[PDB]
RNA sequence: AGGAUAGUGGCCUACCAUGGUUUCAACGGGUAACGGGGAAUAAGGGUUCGAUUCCGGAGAGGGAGCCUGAGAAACGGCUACCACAUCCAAGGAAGGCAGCAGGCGCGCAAAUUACCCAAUCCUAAUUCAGGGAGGUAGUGACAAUAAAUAACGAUACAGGGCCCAUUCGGGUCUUGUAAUUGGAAUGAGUACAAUGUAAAUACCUUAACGAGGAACAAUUGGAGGGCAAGUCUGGUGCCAGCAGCCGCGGUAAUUCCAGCUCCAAUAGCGUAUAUUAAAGUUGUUGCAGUUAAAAAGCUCGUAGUUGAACUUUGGGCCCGGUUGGCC
RNA sequence: GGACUUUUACUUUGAAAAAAUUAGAGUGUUCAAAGCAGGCGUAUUGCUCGAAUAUAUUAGCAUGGAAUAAUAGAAUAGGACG
C-alpha cells in the first residue's frame, strides 16, 4: 500500500541471435567507440527506434496539425540540442534516418577523445570512471552523458583531482615519499 | 518395450578416460578490454587466414 | 462470395462460427478442457517432487542401441507412478533408492523426448543437491 | 553541500516550535529516559486487567499468600 | 387492501387473474472465475492475463441470531449449534492470526517472534496521548537504471606511403605483438571525522591505509545443419552416452568423455512449465473445400443474413474566412 | 408561455468518462530508470516560471449534416389549406 515506482527497461535484443552481418557490424561500433557490451549498443537502437516511432506517426498526420507542430519541433529541438541532429536538418524527415551511431558520437566517452586529452577511447573511458572529468563544475563518471552542445566547451579535467592540481596523486605520493624517506 | 537390461556399465566411459589438468595460462582481459582484444585480432590482424579465414 | 457472411449485421454468425472452429486447435481445446489439471501427472506445474522406487534399464527405439538408465518415481502430491530420466554420463549411481527427487519435463510438452520409449520427465535433483552439480563435483550427496 | 536552515526571533520561540529530536541534537533540551516500545505495550496490557487502584487487591492476595 | 420497513416494491399476508423468460442461447452444468482501472506481445486487426500498491464487493473456522449506536447481522462484540482445540487441585473456565512478526503442515514455490511515531495521515474530552495504519532497518539475483575486472610511454619484431633512388643502409610518420622495461590513475575493501536519520546501518563527501598477476584471477552455455564457433589431440567403440528436430556412437567420432583452440550473451547465463509473436496453422482485415482434411444424396422451408431502379438537379447574385503570390 | 411536432441507423463537434498506468511538453536525479521539481539576484533585504497536454472501446446527453440503408403518409378519401 504505497505509490508504485514507475520503471522501464532500456534495451531490446535482436530477433536473430546468430548472423554474421549484425555481429560483425556491432563489433565495429564497440571498438570504434569503446563499448563494453552489445547492450551498450542495443540501448541506442531502443532509443532511436522510439524516436523514429514518434516521427513516423507524426508524419502521417496532415501538415499544420497543432499536435504535429508542437511535438515535431520539441522532438527536433531536443535532438538538435544534444547535437545528434544537425542544425540544417530540421524537417522532421532527417530525424527518421539519422544513423545508429549518431547518438553514439555524443557519448562523453567518445566526446573526450574528440577534445584530445585521452589519445584513445579506452583511455577516455577510464578517465571518466576515475573521476577526472568535470563537464561543468560538477564531476561526472558516466561514459554515456550526451553533452548538450553547450557544455562541450566546458569539458575540462576535474579541479579536485590529479591532472587538475591540488594533489600529486595516490601512488605518486608513495613514489615521492619513497625518494624523501630514502634521501637520508 | 523391454524394461530390463544391464546397469553394470553405468558411467563406463566416464571412468575409463584419463585425467588431464587445466594448462595454466595468463588470465584474459574481461569486459571492455576484451572488446579491444576481439576487435584487433579479427578486424586488423589477418593472420588466421589459413584457407577460409580459419581461426581454428 | 467466399463462404463467410459479409453483411454489416452478421457479427453473431461470425462470432459463433469462430468458436465452433476454435475447438479444432489442439492447444485451444487442451487449455479449455483442462486436461493438464485432470491428467499429465503433474498438477500443471513446472516441477514436482517424488520418491525413487526402482531403477530401470529402458532400451532405445530403433535405430539405436543403448540403455537409458531411467528411474520409477512416485509423485508426492498425487501418488502416481512416472518414469524419469537421469540425464548425464553415468549419474544413475547417485539415485540409488528412496531418494526425494525433483523432476522436470523434457521440453517436448508432454511427448517423449527421443529414442527413449514412453518417458516424459527427467531428474533434476536428488535430495535437493542439484544432480547436475554432483556430476561436476561441485557438491556432495548428504549422508542422510 | 546544500541544506535547509531555520532561524528564530529568539530562543523562546526556538524551544517552543522546534521538535524535541532536533533540540536534543543541539543540547538545548535533554533526552528523556524512556523504556522500549514493546515493554510499554506489555506494561499497558498488564495493568488493563486490574480494575481500580489495585491496593485492595494487592493486600487481598497478600492474605492469600499466607496460605 | 393491509402489515413490515428508514423508506418504493410479493418484501410478507388475504382474496383475485394466469400470468412471466426462451434458438437474438432462457434454464441447467463447468470455471484450475471477486469485477474493473490495468499488464504481456503486437504493422494493422487481435490473442492471453488481472490473488496483488487505486476504486467497488464479500469474509473473519461453517451457519444462524442479536445488543449497543447515526452507522454492524460487527466477530482483536455477544448468544446457540457443528468441527477443531486450551488449562483443570475433575466441580469448571476460557478460544478464534484471510491484522504485524513467528511456528507446523501443504507443497516446485514466497522474508525478522528487529526499531520508531520523526515524516503521510487517522482517532479521542484532543497541540502533548494512542496508532504492527504507516515509516526505518534486516533477509531478498522476483523484476528494473547506471556501471568495475584496467590505462599510457620507450626498446625489440611484422607492416604502408615517402626521403634518399649511392647495391640489401639509415630510416623521418602510422598499427599490432614480446618468459621486454617503466613510472602514473582509481575504485571495490578497511576507517579518524563530518553528513545522514527519532537513534542508528547505508548513500553523497572525506584523515590515513588500500593492483601487478600465482594476483583484487568472470561466469553460463556451445563449436554437423537450423545457428558463427574445429575434421585439432587423447580416451570409448551401437558400450557409455549426446541429441528440442534431422541424427551421432559398430577401432581415423569435427556431435559422447577429457585437453587445446574458437564463439555467443555477460553480473549474468542455462533449464522446465504456461502464454504472446512467428500463425494468412482460427483467417472481419485474411485461410481452405475436383484430386492433399473438408460441398449435406436432393428439394421445400421458418428464425438469421442479404435484397433492382426512381422523388430539389442545375444556373446566377452577393458577403465573409484559410493557404500562397511580387508588394 | 402556446399548437403540433414520422420515426431510426450513420457521421462531425462538445461536455462526461477518478488518480496511478500508456504517449507526450519542461526540467540536473552527475547520465539513466526515476521524481515533479526547479531557476535567478547585489546571496547582506528577496524575485519567479511550472506541476500542461494527448489517449480513453462500447452504453447514456446536447448540437450540425442529411448522401447512404430503413420507416410512415392522400385511394370502398372522417385527405389539406379556410
Ligand atoms: Mg426467412
PDB file of C-alpha atoms (C1' of nucleotides) in Angstrom, chain D residues 1 16 19 21-22 24-25 31 34-38 40-41 44, chain E residues 114-118 127 129-132 134 195-199:
ATOM      1  CA  UNK D   1      26.665  20.968   0.389  1.00  0.00           C
ATOM      2  CA  UNK D  16       8.520  26.133  21.663  1.00  0.00           C
ATOM      3  CA  UNK D  19      10.721  19.292  17.770  1.00  0.00           C
ATOM      4  CA  UNK D  21      14.540  15.362  18.495  1.00  0.00           C
ATOM      5  CA  UNK D  22      16.263  18.396  16.985  1.00  0.00           C
ATOM      6  CA  UNK D  24      18.349  17.260  21.919  1.00  0.00           C
ATOM      7  CA  UNK D  25      20.576  17.150  18.831  1.00  0.00           C
ATOM      8  CA  UNK D  31      16.723  13.478  26.016  1.00  0.00           C
ATOM      9  CA  UNK D  34      12.261   6.028  28.006  1.00  0.00           C
ATOM     10  CA  UNK D  35      11.952   2.249  28.045  1.00  0.00           C
ATOM     11  CA  UNK D  36      11.460   0.076  24.976  1.00  0.00           C
ATOM     12  CA  UNK D  37       8.254   0.328  22.970  1.00  0.00           C
ATOM     13  CA  UNK D  38       7.439  -3.353  23.484  1.00  0.00           C
ATOM     14  CA  UNK D  40       5.477  -0.121  27.453  1.00  0.00           C
ATOM     15  CA  UNK D  41       2.856  -2.017  25.449  1.00  0.00           C
ATOM     16  CA  UNK D  44      -0.106  -1.212  29.313  1.00  0.00           C
TER      17      UNK D  44
ATOM     18  C1'   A E 114      14.048  -6.135  14.965  1.00  0.00           C
ATOM     19  C1'   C E 115      13.490  -0.165  15.787  1.00  0.00           C
ATOM     20  C1'   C E 116      10.020   4.096  15.944  1.00  0.00           C
ATOM     21  C1'   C E 117       5.769   7.522  15.943  1.00  0.00           C
ATOM     22  C1'   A E 118      10.416  11.502  13.302  1.00  0.00           C
ATOM     23  C1'   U E 127      -1.084  20.987  20.116  1.00  0.00           C
ATOM     24  C1'   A E 129      -1.764  10.672  24.359  1.00  0.00           C
ATOM     25  C1'   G E 130      -2.541   6.330  21.096  1.00  0.00           C
ATOM     26  C1'   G E 131      -1.704   4.171  16.099  1.00  0.00           C
ATOM     27  C1'   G E 132       2.494  -3.770  13.833  1.00  0.00           C
ATOM     28  C1'   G E 134       2.464   3.816   8.418  1.00  0.00           C
ATOM     29  C1'   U E 195      26.679  14.447   6.893  1.00  0.00           C
ATOM     30  C1'   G E 196      22.612  11.082   7.268  1.00  0.00           C
ATOM     31  C1'   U E 197      18.358   9.758  10.304  1.00  0.00           C
ATOM     32  C1'   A E 198      13.645   9.520  16.194  1.00  0.00           C
ATOM     33  C1'   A E 199      18.740   6.627  17.351  1.00  0.00           C
TER      34        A E 199
END
